[PDB]
Amino acid sequence: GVTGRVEFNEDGDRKFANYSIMNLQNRKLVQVGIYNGTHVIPNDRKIIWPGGETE
């Protein structure tokens, strides 16, 4: 499978689904991180908060 490791739980759902993270940066969808089946990896892009600093 192109998605990857397809496996079912006791509920018959999907396991280890990779997720994409988007930030609304000036009304444009900019990728800011990726999600593994168990861990989150931010990308090289920065994320701006509604206020000031990126922290």
Partner: antibody, heavy 119, light 114 residues
Framework: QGQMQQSGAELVKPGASVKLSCKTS????????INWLKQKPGQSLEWIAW????????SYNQKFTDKAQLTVDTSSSTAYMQFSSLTTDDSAIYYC???????????????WGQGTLVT | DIVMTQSPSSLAVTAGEKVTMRCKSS????????????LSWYQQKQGQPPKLLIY???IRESWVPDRFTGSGSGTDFTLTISNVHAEDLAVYYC???????????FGGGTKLEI
């Protein structure tokens, strides 16, 4: 290299509707932005609307918010613009273009269709 | 819509000379937080899709030769060619890229003649 191919020329009666197609290829169809522009002959292009294929987010020009509708087909990677209540003012050339974004920053329309004339 | 003012409207020069084309926006295209100008210079030749020439009012594209020089900041911007060639003959447009300043608008344009 990405390619955008538009539909052929249309002769539409006034007050009727036309739905134009714009097949896209050579790039990530889901993660890009496509814009429809109205260009009358001898005139500059008029921005109509933009749509994001990954989220179905739609934004139209106020002049065309009640006139044009946009749809996409992920299986075919083809953009669609349906122009309804057509009038003689709509006798113009419509173009579909793919946005060029560098380092996450928009840098202008880098790809274009061949153009479609609606009479 | 931010009004983009381009000057001159058209010009004709001999090969080898230096030209200057100005772009003026009705509003400041500079965002204070990042101090970047949302201005893009383009080269549009007859019968072809426009080719992105300079973005950020100062940065040339990879395919753009060093002879092109974009300057200006805030509301006023300038496109300058140090060594004008015959191939450069085209109509050049400056367009704002500020997402908070939608919709995107274009200036009047400058026609280059040789």
């Amino acid at each position: 290299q990405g390619q955008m191919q538009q539909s052929g020329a249309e002769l539409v009666k006034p007050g009727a509707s036309v739905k134009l197609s714009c097949k896209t290829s050579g790039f990530s169809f889901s993660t890009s932005y496509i814009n429809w522009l109205k260009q009358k002959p001898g005139q500059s292009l008029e921005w109509i609307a933009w749509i994001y294929a990954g989220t179905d987010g739609t934004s139209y020009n106020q002049k065309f918010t009640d006139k044009a509708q946009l749809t996409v087909d992920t299986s075919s990677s083809t953009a669609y613009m349906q122009f309804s209540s057509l009038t003689t003012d709509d006798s113009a050339i419509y173009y579909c273009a793919r946005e060029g974004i560098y380092y996450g920053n928009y840098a202008g329309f880098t790809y274009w269709g061949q153009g479609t004339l609606v009479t | 819509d931010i009004v983009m003012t381009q000057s001159p409207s058209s010009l004709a020069v001999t090969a080898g000379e230096k030209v200057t084309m100005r772009c003026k926006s009705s509003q400041s295209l500079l965002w204070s937080v990042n101090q970047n100008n949302y201005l893009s210079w383009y080269q549009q030749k007859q019968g072809q899709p426009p080719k992105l020439l300079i973005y950020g009012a100062s940065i040339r594209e990879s395919w753009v030769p060093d002879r092109f020089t974009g300057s200006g900041s805030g509301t006023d911007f300038t496109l300058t060619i140090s060594n004008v060639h015959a191939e450069d003959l085209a109509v050049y447009y400056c367009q704002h890229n500020h997402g908070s300043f939608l919709p995107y608008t274009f200036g009047g344009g400058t026609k280059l003649e040789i």
